[PDB]
Amino acid sequence: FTKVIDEPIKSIMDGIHDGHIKKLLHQYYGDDESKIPAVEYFGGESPVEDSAVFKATSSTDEESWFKALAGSEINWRHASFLCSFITQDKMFVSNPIRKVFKPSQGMVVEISNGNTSSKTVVTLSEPVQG
């Protein structure tokens, strides 16, 4: 299959990728792009209600906690709570939102407009001076 000299790496890889997409579309979506399920962003998925109120305890499961805050719809808040890493310029540091909302006795997380991504507002509240 190594025949065409000085083909750009994009042209090779895209050719293979598109080849697969064209073949899957014909076999499993009846040659119709409109049957392809959409999302907002595709990635960071480990292989393993409008207005809500969560209350962290001592025994609260960290992974269950973040999943609850994240929601089910893939959107900005799903990334915010389940991305392990965020970018500073070209560097990959630990997601500071997960560090901040790390669950501990006292913390209360009130989500409002958790159906529309545009208008969602995750509020954290803690015992401050009682």
Partner: peptide
């Protein structure tokens, strides 16, 4: 193997 597209439109396997 499934197809899925992002908000932009880019189809992925």
């Amino acid at each position: 193997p499934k197809l899925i597209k992002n908000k932009s439109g880019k189809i992925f396997v």
